Design a protein around this ligand. Structure first.
Ligand code: KS3
Ligand code: KS3
Ligand code: PLP
Length: 810
């Protein structure tokens, strides 16, 4: 059908049909008379997976022979989503498979909807790791993603009476055709025990053993025949474990619980023992694998030339003391030499400045679970603080501030400090965030070692986030500038020469319209909900957090409603306001925000005077597969965090690439997006970081805004009085009380500017041609936000390796 989906050659289509029928019979053990759509999905998945195998084996062979420097990306989260379409895109098989399945009497798009998301992450951090793997394969890097194979990923969200309910995400129920178990490469991981000091060094003894069994998933690059590996560890008990008899076998679950479930808190640290076990499990198993591979190339001097370890936040920070443990206790290197190797091998990426997100582990947990690691951390801390003392003599407060050990009611280890001390590079994830790190929370470290601190602005993969989810847009672009931009996104700048082209303008607008119709239909079909496809689609999708200010959006929505009720017969640009995202199960305020959004919808969506001029929809169970549907349909992207709180954002970039305009604060990567596109082509409002600091200095008083803004006062009175909850008048008291007395994120402070900016949005939307021209200016300048650009910068500036676009032989 469409060009970017590749060729449907008669030979290929014939071979796909043959192999589809073979898998249906031999693999699935079904015949066509009792096969269901799910069986058909699996037969297609197995058929496509067969095309990965040769390339996967040949890629890994090639790395063994060439022995390039290896990049190990350690993360507790990989938010992969679905694999079938991505695989077809990257192998150029989409049109051929579409043709093959069509000839068999099947609709391939229907089969694609059967696949479960692999939801092994919470949101942005997990999804960044997934984009990065795609980019590393596309750039020919010898890269490995290492993590945990959670049996249960991020929970499925149901909304019941407007309240979030959680259900386990049993993603493996029907099998995962995209992994290969590798029980033969199972490795031991040690916990508890004690340290005994011999003549010949320390020894960690009397430990409990848990086995780490790897499952390997292929990661194909874009049309280059490179297939890299994501290796995820699963926890298994040893066979003598606990070995009355029956209970001993049942108690194997104690050990196997390590890989059972993803912790579902985004940007909130909870110091639980099970989480610490997960963190050590991934690190200990991964490092044995790294060392094995290095020895199969005595002399650890060359280790940093052959290995890079990238720590995705502090979650895998135990890699630093574990590497020291292995080098010092087992390989018997002297400390100083081991430390040199460690520093040169490890690099750390920070993703947040919110204090409650920082990992600070109680010393008593480490003492019990990882006694040798605690000893090593103390020794690291003493040597590091000796350096600080020599550089800043007499500055005793600096010593207290920079220590890895935090004193207090309970002593804790600051894992960010450990990562900075033990890494040769530390980066933030957008320019403003990297600047904040140097000016505020890591100022002392930057003064000691300025050379360590870098920026690497985040990005997204244009395979998943343009070609896959928005083929219509990819096609009209390829018609003008060819296909090369899919792996070199800077080529989208060529589209600026089409901003006055009447045909292009019409086609861009047509593609958006078709995406909106398709999404509106998806809504009715699978959620019995009915929306006006000519309305402006105003979308805020992301995890629910106070810092992301879904509440500020709610205040604007109520303002619009109240203004309509005040002048019903006045024209206003029709809107469909869609808000979606998951709340962490124990985050009460986030759960109340979801309830408020559904409560607003209950009133607004059923007021006859409003008609179809304003609809408010809560999008249930937001996840990667839903993002792939809603983002291409959006007109307006809400990126409205308080300045200084969103480290980067990546949803922002997805919307920009897909033809939405952005309303946002000067926060995270929004700053760089507006710089690339031009401020005139962005809807910027609100306090800058400097304004927030000024307000904090004189003291934020929400009452002032309530007193001076009558439209705001009216909304608070509606909330307090029970307008949005007739049967439970005081339901939203916690929200009102937070807004008035304890709002860390200054919602009222940005309200007036936000409402005014939203009026400018509405005014531009009334002029379709100028709206679309501004869209083209956004799409055309989105190239910087490719994760290929991001990964090339990590490669050159941190890992010391050169990317390659050269194809391996098929
Ligand atoms: O080994 C992992 C899984 O192995 C399946 C199996 N999987 C494969 C396989 C074969 C080829 C593959 C190519 C890329 C995608 C992953 C791939 C997986 N061969 N055997 C078994 O049916 C399942 O119970 C088991 O958990
Ligand atoms: O860099 C990718 C994204 O990382 C998000 C992020 N996610 C987390 C995160 C994610 C998971 C966590 C679980 C344990 C405790 C703290 C946790 C913190 N920190 N930062 C940022 O909010 C976003 O701006 C950023 O775009
Ligand atoms: C991109 C993405 C995120 C990150 O969105 P932000 O708006 O940057 O927080 C979260 N969840 C999913 C499913 C995503 O695809």
């Amino acid at each position: 059908q469409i060009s970017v989906r590749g060729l449907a050659g008669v030979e290929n289509v014939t071979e796909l049909k043959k192999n589809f029928n073979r898998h249906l019979h031999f693999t699935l053990v079904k015949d066509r008379n009792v096969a269901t759509p799910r069986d058909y999905y699996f037969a297609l998945a197995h058929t496509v997976r067969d095309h990965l195998v040769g390339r996967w084996i040949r890629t890994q062979q090639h790395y063994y022979e060439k022995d390039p420097k290896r990049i190990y990306y350690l993360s507790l989260e990989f938010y992969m989503g679905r694999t079938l379409q991505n695989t077809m895109v990257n192998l150029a098989l989409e049109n051929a498979c579409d043709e093959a399945t069509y000839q068999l009497g099947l609709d391939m798009e229907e089969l694609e909807e059967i696949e479960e998301d692999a939801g092994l992450g919470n949101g942005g951090l997990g999804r960044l790791a997934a984009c990065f793997l795609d980019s590393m394969a596309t750039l020919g890097l010898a890269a490995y993603g290492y993590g945990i194979r959670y049996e249960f990923g991020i929970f499925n969200q149901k909304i019941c009476g407007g309240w979030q309910m959680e259900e386990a995400d049993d993603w493996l129920r029907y099998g995962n055709p995209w992994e290969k178990a590798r029980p033969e490469f199972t490795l031991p991981v040690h916990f508890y025990g004690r340290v005994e000091h011999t003549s010949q060094g320390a020894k960690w003894v009397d430990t409990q053993v848990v086995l780490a069994m790897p499952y390997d998933t292929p990661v194909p690059g874009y049309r280059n025949n490179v297939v890299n590996t994501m290796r995820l560890w699963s926890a298994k008990a040893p066979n003598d474990f606990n070995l009355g008899y029956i209970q001993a076998v049942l108690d194997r679950n104690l050990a196997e619980n390590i890989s059972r479930v993803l912790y579902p808190n985004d940007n909130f640290f909870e110091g639980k023992e099970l989480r610490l076990k997960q963190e050590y499990f991934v690190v200990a198993a991964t490092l044995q694998d790294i060392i094995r591979r290095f020895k199969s190339s005595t002399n650890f001097d060359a280790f940093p030339d052959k290995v890079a370890i990238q720590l995705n936040d502090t979650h895998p920070s135990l890699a630093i003391p574990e590497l020291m443990r292995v080098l010092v206790d087992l390989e018997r290197l002297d400390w100083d030499k081991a430390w040199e190797v460690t520093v040169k091998t490890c690099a750390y990426t920070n993703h947040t400045v919110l204090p409650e997100a920082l990992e600070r582990w109680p010393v008593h947990l480490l003492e019990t679970l990882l006694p040798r690691h605690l000893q090593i951390i103390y020794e690291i801390n003493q040597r590091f603080l000796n350096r600080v003392a020599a550089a800043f003599p007499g500055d005793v407060d600096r010593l207290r501030r920079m220590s890895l050990v935090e004193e207090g009611a309970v002593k804790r280890i600051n894992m960010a400090h450990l990562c900075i001390a033990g890494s040769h590079a530390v980066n933030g994830v957008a320019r403003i965030h990297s600047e904040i790190l140097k000016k505020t929370i890591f100022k002392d470290f930057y003064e000691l070692e300025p050379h360590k601190f870098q920026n690497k602005t985040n990005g997204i993969t244009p395979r998943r986030w343009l070609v896959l989810c928005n083929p219509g847009l990819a096609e009209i672009i390829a018609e003008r500038i060819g296909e090369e931009y899919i792996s070199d996104l800077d080529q989208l700048r060529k589209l600026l020469s089409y901003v006055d082209d009447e045909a292009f303008i019409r086609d861009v607008a047509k593609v958006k319209q078709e995406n909106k119709l398709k999404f509106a239909a998806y809504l009715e079909r699978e959620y019995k909900v009915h929306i006006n496809p000519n309305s402006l689609f105003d979308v805020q999708v992301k995890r629910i957090h106070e810092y992301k200010r879904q509440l500020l959006n709610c205040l604007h929505v109520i303002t619009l409603y109240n203004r309509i009720k005040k002048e019903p017969n006045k024209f206003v640009v029709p809107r469909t306001v869609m808000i979606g995202g998951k709340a962490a199960p124990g985050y009460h305020m986030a759960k109340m925000i979801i309830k408020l959004i559904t409560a607003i919808g209950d009133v607004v969506n059923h007021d006859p005077v409003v008609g179809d001029r304003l609809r408010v929809i809560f999008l249930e169970n937001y996840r990667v597969s839903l993002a792939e549907k809603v983002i291409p349909a959006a007109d307006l992207s809400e990126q409205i965090s308080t300045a200084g709180t969103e480290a980067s954002g990546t949803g922002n970039m997805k919307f920009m690439l897909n033809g939405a305009l952005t309303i946002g604060t000067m926060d995270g990567a929004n700053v760089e997006m507006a710089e690339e596109a031009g401020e005139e082509n962005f809807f910027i409002f609100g306090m800058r970081v400097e304004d927030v600091d000024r307000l904090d200095q004189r003291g934020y008083n929400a009452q002032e805004y309530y007193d001076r803004i009558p439209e705001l006062r009216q909304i608070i009175e509606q909330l307090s009085s029970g307008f949005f909850s007739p049967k439970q008048p005081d339901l939203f008291k916690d929200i009102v009380n937070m807004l008035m007395h304890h709002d860390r994120f200054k919602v009222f402070a940005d309200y007036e500017e936000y409402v005014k900016c939203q009026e400018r949005v509405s005014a531009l939307y009334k002029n379709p041609r100028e709206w679309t021209r501004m869209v083209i200016r956004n799409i055309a300048t989105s190239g910087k936000f490719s994760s290929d650009r991001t990964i090339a910068q990590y490669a050159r500036e941190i890992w010391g390796v050169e990317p390659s676009r050269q194809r391996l032989p098929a």
